[PDB]
Amino acid sequence: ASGYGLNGGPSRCFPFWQELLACYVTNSSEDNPDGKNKCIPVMEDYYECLHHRKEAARVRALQAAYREAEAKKLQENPPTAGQIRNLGLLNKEEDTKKVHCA
Amino acid sequence: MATRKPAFNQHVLLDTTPLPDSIPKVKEIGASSAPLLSASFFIGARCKDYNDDYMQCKNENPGRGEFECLKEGRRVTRCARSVLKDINTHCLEQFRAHWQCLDNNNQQLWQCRPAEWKLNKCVYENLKLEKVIPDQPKNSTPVHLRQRQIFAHHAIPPWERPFIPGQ
Amino acid sequence: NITLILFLIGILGFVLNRKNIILMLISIEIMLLSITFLILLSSLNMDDIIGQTYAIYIIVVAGAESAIGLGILVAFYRLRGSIAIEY
Amino acid sequence: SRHIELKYPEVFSHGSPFNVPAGFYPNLDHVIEHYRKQHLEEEERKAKKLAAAAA
Amino acid sequence: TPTQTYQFPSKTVKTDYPLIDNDPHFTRVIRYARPSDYAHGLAAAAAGPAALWLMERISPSQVGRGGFAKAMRLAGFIGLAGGFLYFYQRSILRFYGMSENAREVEMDMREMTDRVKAGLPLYGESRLSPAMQGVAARQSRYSALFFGVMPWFNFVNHNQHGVDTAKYYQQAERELEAERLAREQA
Amino acid sequence: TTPRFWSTPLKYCRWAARERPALFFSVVIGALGPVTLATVPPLRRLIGDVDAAPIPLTYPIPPGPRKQLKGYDDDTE
Amino acid sequence: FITSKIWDGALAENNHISSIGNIMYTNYNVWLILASFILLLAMVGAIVITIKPR
Amino acid sequence: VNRILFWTGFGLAVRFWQLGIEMRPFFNRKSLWAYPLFGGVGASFGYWLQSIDEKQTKMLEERKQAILEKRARRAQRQAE
Amino acid sequence: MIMISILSLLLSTSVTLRRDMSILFNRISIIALAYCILHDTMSLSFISKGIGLHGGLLHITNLTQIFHIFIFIISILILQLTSFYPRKVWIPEYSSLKDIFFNKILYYRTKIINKMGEHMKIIEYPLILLFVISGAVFLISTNDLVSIFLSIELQSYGLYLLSTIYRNSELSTTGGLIYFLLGGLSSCFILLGTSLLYVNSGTTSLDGLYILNSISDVNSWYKPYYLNFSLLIFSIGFLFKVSAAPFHFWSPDVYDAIPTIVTTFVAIIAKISIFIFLLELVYYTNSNANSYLSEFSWTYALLISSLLSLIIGTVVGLTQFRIKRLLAYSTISHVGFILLALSVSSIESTQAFIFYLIQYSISNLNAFFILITIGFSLYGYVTNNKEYKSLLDKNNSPIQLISQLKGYFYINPLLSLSLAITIFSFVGVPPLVGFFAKQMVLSAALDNGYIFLSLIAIITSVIGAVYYLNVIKEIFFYSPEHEVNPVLNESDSNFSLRILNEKNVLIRSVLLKGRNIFISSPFSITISIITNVILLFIFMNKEWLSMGTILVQILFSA
């Protein structure tokens, strides 16, 4: 919310806070009681940026699907780390073709 | 992924999935870190408009600029590929002399002036491009043109002359 | 989770203390080191420098309470000759 | 009042000016037009008040 | 016309008179002070030293030889301090719109328009960064209102003053169009 | 013996420079900072020593509408 | 947790103390004023309750 | 009651109580000037309270009219 | 101006070691506080729920300035206790303008006026109060969590130092030690609460927290449960600092141990700043829509504190025999009324809250002045009672027992009626001002559904009136155990007073006995101004109550 981050630049969740301040100030007044009800989803995104609960929930099911989807399929030839570490290198074209199965 | 500096990273996660065919492909820049610094002032002499347009498109569309600004980024990597291509076509010897200097000098520009001045000579003759640093003070010699560099580790020999465009 | 445990330690210093007015001095500072430590670890999580600064000012007020606290404890000892609590 | 009016509306001008990535800051001219209307309305009320009661 | 006269969000305060500036520069505050502002500051400033001398005569301190001279110096500094703060705070509330300011609205309109037609930046040129100018402005906006607790003064040439500057430009335009016809007439 | 500042201001300053030198010249140096702020900067602008422009600490985005470039397109690739 | 590099935000990176300094003396300088006064009170008060004057 | 009257008397009452608390004599001739001074301060404070009263009356008047717009304008928008 | 005052006074007291130079530094602290009143008085020409200043870390409000000036004047009245000698010598021969202005009186004043008394010798005492006042007027105007924390510590730390400044009393140093050790734990609670606020909201600004609470108050992944849990820990620390039961055991002990001069200041100033700050926090944390948020309202801790403070404060005070312990418990029963008005958040309760705080701060001040003046009065009296002989710090707290006030009506009748008028105001008997305060708090509670608490409050008000009447019965229903000093009136015992003129020539000599020694005018006049305000409020109520009605009209406006 402050606007100042660790590296001298701005804070990561400051855009969401201004998107939430702008919503409340330009949609809610004393004339209209429920205008602040457009700030609900905007406030959720701000709380998500700071804490990352819904993304954690999403990436915790998707990772449970993939890990048992790639646990039962047949494995032909797993590329070794040394092969991956030569990927995209100008004299190791053989390893890159193996990695990308082209 | 997040822009946070990592403290306990022990593994790398690579995704071999290719970009979709909908998005026009672009050959990527292949110059390493020191070749880029040697050609940095040349690139912004030519691609400044494309470099500034790309940064403006992103500013114009907040939170959505990695997407929706993809054509502009391809324009910048083509402008810079033409500078890197042009320098190799005419100044290859002077270019490699300067960037190999910067390799052993902490990539600090004031540490390789004799090599830079020769490259600036060849690029201005061959490509009519000129190193310009904007908003420099007016009451003194430009730092990139001074016969003496105070913070240089090795002294600049007096016969090594700074390249003034026209003398 | 370490921040909450270390907060308990400061609390429990107040639970087990019938005679040490010095451990009451100590546990207040353990409690301050929990709260500053919690602020700091959440600041790293949110990329905010204000959490770091708020820690700094907690550390400066914490030292000042030690000066006022040990100064008053000196004034008491001069006329008492004992920090003990008869019980 | 169930509505809060910011005592410091100048926090919309907050934020680091350094190491700013393109697109990071939001387009807040809808906000500045709110506050412009608020200043112009208040200038009008006093204008309409100490000029129609000064005659 | 810069096409944007209200460039920053500013706080509107409910007051009875027109706002000239959220954050007047120190010299403008001095320069607009009416001669009553000087009488009042001097009157308050002498009061703390004179209150202290009055107390010593009516209810003597019984202090030693040099003690009252020392106290007279301190009461005198506080009087010059409180006296100047009151004089400054009296002038600057006309800028804020919290005091009748008909005189200073005219003096403000003239000078600010005379600056526009001279090509001058409306609020002057700042050696500070646009970002440090915005920090300075947020610190000093309506700060004379906190003088009894904390002293602050504006010594920066920022362009954030809470007012829509279209009127100064509009009046410059209407004044330029008036002078041009006169020159064309003769 | 030792003078009094508010009776003899100049005479106290000589005694303090001679008898309390570290203390006296501390207040002197501390006052020179306030003076150097007041004096050199206007004299610098008199001799034409213009302050250097600030260095960029963010990407320098130019103001105004986008320029509508043409060049370096997908066909050129 | 996953992290990736950025270039526009890495132009002139500051150490945490320079980032604290960029704002500690300007934007949030009221916090410095109160702290200066808390330390100043802990000086005067603790000296006055312990020492015998003169 | 009259404010200038109440406050003038309040200052005269304050002098009588002070002498009673001190147990000093009320009405000695060389100190009778105190009653005029205490009364004059009571007069002055009260001329200041009359200015306070005048302004508060304008404010409470305005507010009771504002609450009578908010209640009115809301009823106007509820007629739809 | 408070900051320019501290620095200038600090520099002057830093280069002096003279203790005779304290009475004058306290006089300048009164003149210094007068310039602050001239500056905040002129900062009241606007309508706003608030203006954030100095980067949003501070705010200014009409309620903020009024309280800043009230704080400064309550401070100027306590400062008089250390700026004027306790007793004076008056003769009708030196009583006119020409005399008090152009003539002079010379006599041996040291033992009459207690020139080298303890309260006349600390040089930093005017400075320490000014650092407490600074923390109080900052707490009123704090817009950020850090600002709250830094202000509360500035005020708390200076209260501990004031409570330890009589360095040569075993009682005073004991009390400062109890205050710091229980006060430091209270600060952890205030720090824990603010930390848990920022760590869940990402913000330290109160207005952002108010808006996050505003958007939540609508009748899924991120419930805002933290706000009511954080503010309940947060209010626990502030409950301790104002000594509300259950966190009240510290006040009777600290208020009785420290010197009476000091307990005037410490037992008034901290409540005024803490209670004004809480009111704004209660208004913007309200749940307009009955949802699950209002079930965990932090305001319930204030409702339970008020209920417990009404009982504890009035029941435990029945068996006190020490007057300062009695007055400490009486203050706990008055915060049970202040806390109920705060807990019911209505337009009527806030107006009744504002009145109760100001008038109670004004009346308990009279109760402290009357006590200090009675202590100074017994200088010309002697006693043979064996119990008074064994009291401790008989110089720092001259009146310690309620039995030392037996037959004071016989010694000083109007001082006894001033203490009667003030105590009957604590009871809440009409036409006294303290009635009109409890009337408003009860009407606010009854109008909004707090009938159960009102019946409890009027029950304890009967119980609390028992120990107030014991003080009245003791001063008037009995004969004094204090007799006039026989030597002061010995016929042969007289002190010679010389009347001079402008050029120091004798105008007259006079022979004076102890009958010519009185209370000093600053104390007598201050007592009579407040006793008269309590007794004559029904004829002078429009400006005071109207100020409150306008102030709450803005806080609730729109």
Ligand SMILES: CCCCCCCCCCCCO[C@@H]1O[C@H](CO)[C@@H](O[C@H]2O[C@H](CO)[C@@H](O)[C@H](O)[C@H]2O)[C@H](O)[C@H]1O
């Ligand atoms: C027992 C209750 C204790 C309450 C304590 C607080 C009381 C506060 C009382 C003061 C209230 C404000 O009192 C106010 O002071 C200012 C001082 O410039 C003056 O007010 C004036 O201000 C400016 C001039 O400076 C004018 O433009 C304005 O029109 C006018 O109102 C008036 O004198 C009075 O309206």
Ligand SMILES: CCCCCCCCCCCCO[C@@H]1O[C@H](CO)[C@@H](O[C@H]2O[C@H](CO)[C@@H](O)[C@H](O)[C@H]2O)[C@H](O)[C@H]1O
């Ligand atoms: C024994 C008790 C005796 C009475 C003690 C209290 C008397 C003083 C109460 C004064 C406060 C109420 O009275 C009124 O309040 C409002 C709002 O705060 C303020 O009113 C102020 O703001 C408005 C709005 O811009 C200005 O136009 C006006 O000139 C100014 O006076 C003043 O303060 C005072 O005019």
